[PDB]
Ligand binder design. Structure first.
Ligand SMILES: [Mg+2]
Ligand SMILES: [Mg+2]
Ligand SMILES: [Mg+2]
Ligand SMILES: [Mg+2]
Ligand SMILES: [Mg+2]
Ligand SMILES: [Mg+2]
Ligand SMILES: [Mg+2]
Ligand SMILES: [Mg+2]
Ligand SMILES: [Mg+2]
Ligand SMILES: [Mg+2]
Ligand SMILES: [Mg+2]
Ligand SMILES: [Mg+2]
Ligand SMILES: [Mg+2]
Ligand SMILES: [Mg+2]
Ligand SMILES: [Mg+2]
Ligand SMILES: [Zn+2]
Lengths: 115, 108, 49, 153, 217, 308
RNA sequence: GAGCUACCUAAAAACAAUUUUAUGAAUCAACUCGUCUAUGUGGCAAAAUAGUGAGAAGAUUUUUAGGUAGAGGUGAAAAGCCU
């Protein structure tokens, strides 16, 4: 459950998410009518003095049975047009992104591993 | 918050004589068959119970003298005998408490 | 093969038997003191009338 | 909202509750008949019944000895539990303790009082409530009804 | 005789009939799908069909860290680390889309709950995905793995050193000073283990169930 | 004393007759219940066909508990188990004598003891020839659907695929504050609040110089009759008379509930394909399977669901 | 009226352990004070309790007896203290 001011991990190969500038990116906004962000929910990110959109692909909060609970809050950086900023994702991504309402096919194309 | 007016005896009499504040009459009081004293149906007769414990204290007092000290409880069953009684074969190997008085009629 | 606990009084209870056991606990410290000075020190450190 | 909870709140806290109950249980085993407040006697009755079950397990059982050691503060009672009380209650599967309400306490707190004992003890019998005899008017009419139903199929 | 935990009824005011109805459905599923014996700490491989995909199943391998639930709702959680990312999935035993449950390695651990593995080093949670099952011996007891894991820096998901958790599978000496172990024991509640009214005896209940399960077979 | 005394059924019974009375009462319960097993052979009231706008009688059931249920699509549904125990029609009031708009039927369930009951209730049941029931409830039933009193009602009355309405008393939570009763926010824990954390704020405005009726205040919560609308029936167990109802039902386990066809507009006329007065096992035109299922439900013992 | 309090005179007392360039040094008890918060608000108390804090070999603290008196006394000045 990502909220405002939560520290999140950029699970991507994009330059902005690299370990330099150790300060973790923090959530500024959750694009939901509730402010709670779950898997598949977009958020606005404070990263390296920039404001960038990100998509939640994993979090530590328990979900419904038969679904993966991760050890970190993961996100992928998204361009304003909606194209992913990074070109590869190596960490496992839950398969539930496929069905839920939204535009997630672009991200799934980038990720080899699904869990 | 403090009272704005003195409360009249007319109002006060209605508060403290309301049926909710009265003592309820009890319908469970009965007379004991053996002793003829009063008791409640669901409660043990206090006169008859008074007899039992005072005999119990006499028995326990005798037990204390025999043991003579703390931490001397037997590892075998106990039995109480009154003057004019002798242990039976089944009574063998059981602590015997001796009472000067005769066997109470109710005690068997 | 039953290991019953020893029949001794409580160490901490408010009773005469319990206090006597606490007395023996203090006295054991004297029996276990190697030097004669410690035995006298333990035996006399508490002042009463 | 204390729905479904099976304990009274007694003493200075949960630990104090156990110790207050433990003291009553220790007295019950020694004397076999104890007076306490009705609520406290009811609280300790369950422990009194379960203690006999641990005694039945046997002298050699390690868990029984540890349980007996904790609950019986006066350690002379532990031999009594395993060698006196448990042998007495071998036939029964339960209901070892008898608890009855005694008239209220005459001590200005007017506490509701009870007497708790183990069955089969050596003390003078309590004045238990004796049901009516079959010779009473109502019983005879019912006895007549019973005979007819049994005899007539 | 290993009785699966779900069959044991929890104490309460519920009617026993509610459990008979649930058991009949549980046993019927066990005929279609065989649910193997396993314990917390054993490594399991579970095959499940994905509704998102079409007729395409998925396999997950991990160590079982918790068993919970009774009746048809029984669940178990198993953990693993994949490309350096820890993942846990909670599985419903009787979910119709579980194709198979395979006990890759049957073993028991010092504790019946291994949620502290989240705070332990990654090695203790990483398991090879393609590892083949190890043989098991019927004429034996279940091997009890007595490994005591090493924990990472003190900030943990829970205060495992605290007496309530009753953890016996952590190397506390390496991670905690003797004073900290002393300071923890202020939470000890020693009277808990000795009060006889908090113990639920299921021996007779477990016994009666065993023949009933066998009788239906 | 020449005064009133309290009595109970056991007061004057001896040990020997104490067991005899219990067996005697238990025996009579069995005889009376068996006598009512065959309604069709006991001068049943005329059977009428279903017509649009009809309302059937409902049942009273006991709340057993909950379990998970799965459908052929793999979705999991929490379901509550409702058991019909000794449900019988007791009293009928014609349209005029109850409410000009519709007639009423009283239905009771859950046989109870006869020892601690008022004589008026015992007299009512003696004429009806039934053992007493724990609860009576009233069902509005159209004239064509009226059923003779004393008729046993069974869980197969309802059928899977049917939506239903359940009403029961909610769990009683006692006296409660505004935070728990009405979801009030309360006050901050820190920053100087003086003995105000869970309190109501301002009751009203000062101008009216009074408190409005209906103002939300601390008070006893729960233990009120509530209804849940539009719960599907997933399956019925004929052997034990268990109805499987979607979702939650008001009340605690082992509590009696009232179950009747849903009054929601979408399910306006569902009685068309259900036993119109009720389901009569006595007729036994075809003996029903032990368990009845809804089509979507994935039955246990079926092959594992593969989304092919 | 200085048995409280302010200052002074005489005769006395107390300061563990641990470090230190050897001291109006450091850490921290006893002891002295009273920072911040909650409680209490006819209270346990006409100024307290519970925590949290400051000093703690010194311009330190404390005991006994004496002294200065209202147009006055005392004051590391708060116009503070003098039952
Ligand atoms: Mg209660
Ligand atoms: Mg946490
Ligand atoms: Mg649900
Ligand atoms: Mg309640
Ligand atoms: Mg709040
Ligand atoms: Mg507050
Ligand atoms: Mg007005
Ligand atoms: Mg002076
Ligand atoms: Mg010093
Ligand atoms: Mg200094
Ligand atoms: Mg300091
Ligand atoms: Mg300093
Ligand atoms: Mg000064
Ligand atoms: Mg100034
Ligand atoms: Mg000024
Ligand atoms: Zn009497």
């Amino acid at each position: 459950a990502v909220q405002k001011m939560t520290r999140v991990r950029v699970v991507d190969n994009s330059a902005l998410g690299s370990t330099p500038y150790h300060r973790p990116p923090r959530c500024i906004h959750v694009y939901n009518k509730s402010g709670v962000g779950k898997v598949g929910d977009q958020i606005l990110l404070a990263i390296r003095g920039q404001k960038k959109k990100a998509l939640i692909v994993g979090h530590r909060m328990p979900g419904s049975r038969m679904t993966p609970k991760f050890d970190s809050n993961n996100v992928v950086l998204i361009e304003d047009n909606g194209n992913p900023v990074g070109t590869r994702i190596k960490i496992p991504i839950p398969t539930s992104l496929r069905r839920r309402e939204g535009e997630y096919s672009k991200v799934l194309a980038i990720a080899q591993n699904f869990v | 918050a403090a009272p704005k007016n003195r409360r009249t005896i007319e109002v006060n009499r209605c508060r403290r004589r309301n049926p909710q504040k009265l003592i309820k009459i009890k319908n469970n009081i009965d007379i004991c068959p053996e002793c003829g004293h009063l008791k409640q149906k669901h409660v043990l007769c206090g006169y008859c119970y008074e007899k039992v414990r005072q005999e119990t204290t006499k028995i326990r007092q005798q037990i204390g003298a025999q043991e003579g000290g703390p931490f001397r409880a037997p590892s075998v069953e106990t039995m109480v005998l009154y003057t004019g009684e002798k242990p039976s074969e089944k009574d063998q190997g059981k602590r015997i408490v001796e009472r000067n008085i005769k066997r109470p009629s109710w005690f068997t | 093969v039953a290991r019953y606990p020893p029949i001794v009084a409580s160490m901490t209870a408010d009773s005469k038997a319990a206090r006597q056991r606490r007395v023996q606990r203090w006295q054991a410290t004297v029996h276990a003191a190697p030097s004669v000075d410690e035995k006298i020190r333990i035996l006399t450190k508490m002042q009463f009338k | 909202i204390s729905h479904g909870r099976v304990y009274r709140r007694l003493g200075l806290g949960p630990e104090s509750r156990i110790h207050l109950l433990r003291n009553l249980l220790t007295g019950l085993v020694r004397h076999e008949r104890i007076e306490a407040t009705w609520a406290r006697a009811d609280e300790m009755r369950g422990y009194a019944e379960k203690l006999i079950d641990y005694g039945k397990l046997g002298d050699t059982n390690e868990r029984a000895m540890r349980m007996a050691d904790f609950w019986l503060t006066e350690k002379d009672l532990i031999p009594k539990l395993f060698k006196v009380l448990a042998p007495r209650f071998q036939g029964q599967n339960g209901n070892y303790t008898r608890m009855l309400q005694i008239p209220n306490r005459k001590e200005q707190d007017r506490a509701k009082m009870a007497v708790i004992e183990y069955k089969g003890n050596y003390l003078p019998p309590l004045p238990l409530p004796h049901r009516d005899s079959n010779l009473t008017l109502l019983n005879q009419l019912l006895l007549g009804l019973q005979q007819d139903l049994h005899h007539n199929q | 005789r290993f009785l699966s935990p779900e069959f044991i009824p929890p104490r309460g005011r519920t009617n026993p009939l509610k459990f008979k109805i649930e058991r009949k459905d549980m046993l019927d599923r066990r005929k279609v799908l065989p649910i193997p014996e396993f314990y917390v700490g054993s490594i399991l491989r579970v095959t499940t069909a994905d509704p998102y995909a079409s007729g395409k199943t998925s396999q997950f391998l991990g160590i079982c860290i918790k068993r919970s639930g009774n009746g048809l709702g029984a669940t178990f959680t198993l953990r693993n680390t994949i490309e350096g990312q820890g993942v846990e999935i909670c599985f419903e035993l009787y979910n119709p889309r579980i194709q198979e449950i395979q006990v890759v390695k049957l073993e028991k651990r010092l504790d019946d709950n291994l949620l502290y593995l989240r705070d332990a080093l990654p090695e203790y949670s990483t398991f090879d995905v393609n590892m083949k099952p190890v043989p098991q011996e019927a004429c034996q007891e279940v091997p009890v793995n007595k490994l005591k894991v090493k924990m990472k820096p003190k900030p943990w998901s829970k205060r495992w050193e605290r007496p309530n958790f009753n953890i016996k599978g952590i190397r506390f000496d390496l991670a905690l000073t003797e004073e900290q172990m002393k300071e923890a024991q202020k939470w000890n509640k020693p009277w808990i283990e000795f009060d006889m009214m908090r113990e639920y005896d299921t021996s007779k209940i477990e016994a009666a169930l065993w023949e009933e399960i066998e009788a239906s077979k | 004393l020449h005064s009133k005394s309290s009595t109970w059924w056991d007061e004057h019974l001896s040990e020997e007759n104490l067991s005899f009375v219990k067996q005697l009462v238990s025996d009579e319960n069995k005889t009376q219940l068996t006598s009512k097993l065959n309604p069709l052979k006991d001068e049943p009231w005329p059977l009428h066909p279903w017509e649009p706008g009809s309302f059937r009688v409902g049942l009273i059931a006991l709340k057993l508990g909950m379990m998970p249920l799965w459908t052929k699509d793999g979705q999991k549904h929490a379901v509550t188990l409702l058991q019909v125990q000794d449900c019988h029609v007791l009293k009928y009031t014609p349209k005029e004598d109850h409410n000009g708009k519709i007639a009423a039927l009283t239905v009771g369930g859950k046989t109870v003891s006869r020892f601690y009951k008022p004589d008026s209730r015992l007299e009512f049941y003696r004429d009806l020839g039934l053992p007493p029931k724990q609860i009576h409830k009233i069902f509005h039933v159209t004239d064509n659907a009226v059923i003779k009193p004393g008729t046993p009602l069974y869980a197969a009355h309802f059928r899977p695929g049917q939506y239903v309405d359940v009403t029961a008393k909610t769990i009683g939570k006692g006296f409660q504050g505004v935070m728990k009763r009405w979801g009030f926010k309360g006050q901050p824990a820190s920053h100087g609040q003086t003995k105000t954390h869970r309190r109501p704020g301002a009751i009203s405005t000062g101008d009216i110089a009074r408190v409005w009726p209906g103002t939300k205040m601390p008070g006893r919560m729960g233990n009120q009759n509530r209804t849940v609308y539009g719960l599907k029936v997933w399956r019925v167990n004929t052997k034990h008379n268990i109805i499987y109802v979607n979702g939650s039902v008001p009340g605690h386990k082992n509590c009696l509930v009232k179950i009747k066809d849903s009054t929601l507009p979408a399910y306006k006329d569902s009685c068309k394909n259900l036993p119109f007065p009720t389901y009569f096992p006595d007729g036994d035109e075809e003996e029903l399977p032990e368990d009845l299922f809804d089509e979507s439900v994935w039955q246990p013992s079926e092959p594992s669901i593969t989304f092919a």
